[PDB]
């Protein structure tokens, strides 16, 4: 956009979240969590540069606890898609994504 994004750029839709939840389930979370290493290993399958994925991890791990639940995973998946589409990552997690 002319404005660096639209109403829909950083928001996660119901459909997107349903897809993310399916992918999260495929990782066999334990009591709703995957480890940081598990998450980052999965993300590496996107093709994105490691430095980029490191930034995405830090954005998505909202509570800074080093592990990842379903909400955080959805956020990471949205950021990965945006980066693949050629958007720049934000310096902090957009509130609309939470
Ligand atoms: Ca976390």
Swiss-Prot record:
Free-text tissue specificity from the UniProt record: Isoform 1 is expressed almost exclusively in the brain. Isoform 2 is detected in brain, spleen, lung, liver, heart, skeletal muscle and kidney. Isoform 5 is primarily expressed in brain, spleen, lung and kidney (at protein level). Isoform 1 and isoform 2 are detected in brain. Isoform 2 is ubiquitous in adult and fetal tissues with high expression in skeletal muscle, heart, spleen, ovary, testis and all fetal tissues tested and low expression in thymus, blood, lung, liver and pancreas. Isoform 1 is expressed almost exclusively in the brain, in all brain regions.
Location(s) in or outside the cell: Endomembrane system; Synapse, Synaptosome; Cell projection, Lamellipodium; Cell membrane
Known function: Adapter protein that provides a link between the endocytic membrane traffic and the actin assembly machinery. Acts as a guanine nucleotide exchange factor (GEF) for CDC42, and thereby stimulates actin nucleation mediated by WASL and the ARP2/3 complex. Plays a role in the assembly and maturation of clathrin-coated vesicles. Recruits FCHSD2 to clathrin-coated pits. Involved in endocytosis of activated EGFR, and probably also other growth factor receptors.
Domains (record comment): SH3-3, SH3-4 and SH3-5, but not SH3-1 and SH3-2 domains, bind to dynamin. SH3-1 and SH3-4 bind to ARHGAP31.
Regions crossing the membrane: none
Domain of life: Eukaryota
Binding site for Ca(2+) 1: 61, 63, 65, 67, 72
Gene that this sequence comes from: ITSN1
Complexes and interactors: Interacts (via DH domain) with CDC42. Interacts (via SH3 domain 1) with WASL. Interacts with dynamin, SNAP25 and SNAP23. Interacts with clathrin-associated proteins and other components of the endocytic machinery, such as SPIN90, EPS15, EPN1, EPN2, STON2, FCHO1, FCHO2 and DAB2. Interacts (via SH3 domains) with REPS1 and SGIP1. Interacts with ARHGAP31. Interacts with ADAM15. Interacts with PRRT2. Interacts (via SH3 domain 4) with FCHSD2 (via SH3 domain 2). Interacts (via SH3 domain 1) with DENND2B. Interacts (via SH3 domains) with CBL. Isoform 2: Interacts with CBL and DNM1. (Microbial infection) Interacts with vaccinia virus protein A36.
Positions of the EF-hand domain: 48-83
Organism from which the protein derives: Homo sapiens
Domain EH positions: 16-98
Shown residues in whole-protein numbering: 6 to 103 of 1721
Name of the molecule in the record: Intersectin-1
């Amino acid at each position: 956009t002319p404005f660096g994004g639209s109403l829909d750029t950083w928001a996660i839709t119901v459909e997107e979240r349903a897809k993310h939840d399916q992918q999260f389930h495929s990782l066999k979370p334990i009591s709703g969590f995957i480890t940081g290493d598990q998450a980052r290993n999965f993300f590496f399958q996107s093709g994105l540069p490691q430095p980029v994925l490191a930034q995405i991890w830090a954005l998505a791990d909202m509570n800074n606890d080093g592990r990842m639940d379903q909400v955080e995973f959805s956020i990471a998946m949205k950021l990965i898609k945006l980066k693949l589409q050629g958007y720049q990552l934000p310096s902090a997690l957009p509130p609309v994504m939470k």
